[PDB]
Amino acid sequence: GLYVGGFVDVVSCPKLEQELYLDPDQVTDYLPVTEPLPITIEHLPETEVGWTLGLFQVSHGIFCTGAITSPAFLELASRLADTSHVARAPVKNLPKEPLLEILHTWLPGLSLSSIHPRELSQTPSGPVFQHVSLCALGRRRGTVAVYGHDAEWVVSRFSSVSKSERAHILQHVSSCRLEDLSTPNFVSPL
Ligand SMILES: O=C(Nc1ccc(-c2nnn[nH]2)cc1OC1CCOCC1)c1cccc(CC2CCCCC2)n1
Ligand SMILES: O=C(Nc1ccc(-c2nnn[nH]2)cc1OC1CCOCC1)c1cccc(CC2CCCCC2)n1
Domains of the chain: 1-190 (3.20.16.10)
Please indicate whether residue 102, judged by its CB atom, sits closer than 6 Å to ligand 1: yes
Please indicate whether residue 89, judged by its CB atom, sits closer than 6 Å to ligand 2: no
Give the C-alpha separation, 148 to 10, whole Å.
23
Give the C-alpha separation, 120 to 85, whole Å.
45
User: Can you spell out the DSSP letters for 109-151?
Assistant: EEEEEE--HHHHSS--SS-SEEEEEEESS---SS---EEES-H
Give the C-alpha separation, 41 to 31, whole Å.
23
Question: Which ligand has the nearest atom to the CA of 2?
Answer: 1
State the catalytic residue, choosing from 12, 43, 70, 113: 43
User: Is residue 162 flagged as an active site residue?
Assistant: no
Give the C-alpha separation, 171 to 185, whole Å.
27
**DSSP H or E segment with residue 11:** strand 2-12
**DSSP H or E segment with residue 63:** strand 61-68
Give the C-alpha separation, 146 to 104, whole Å.
6
Give the C-alpha separation, 183 to 150, whole Å.
20
The residues that bridge with 6 in the sheet, in sequence order, are 64
| Resolution for this experimental structure (Å) | 1.9
Give the C-alpha separation, 43 to 129, whole Å.
13
First to last CA, the chain: 21
User: Is residue 43 flagged as an active site residue?
Assistant: yes
Q: 86 by DSSP, 3-state: which? A: helix
Give the C-alpha separation, 132 to 78, whole Å.
22
Neighbours of 59 (CB within 10 A): 10
Question: Technique behind this structure?
Answer: X-ray
Distance between alpha carbon 56 and the CA centroid of its chain, in Å?
12
Give the C-alpha separation, 85 to 87, whole Å.
6
Q: Ligand 1 pocket test: pick from 80, 83, 105, 185 the residue with the most ligand atoms within 8 Å of its Cβ.
A: 80
State the catalytic residue, choosing from 12, 70, 104, 111: 111
User: Is residue 131 flagged as an active site residue?
Assistant: yes
**DSSP H or E segment with residue 8:** strand 2-12
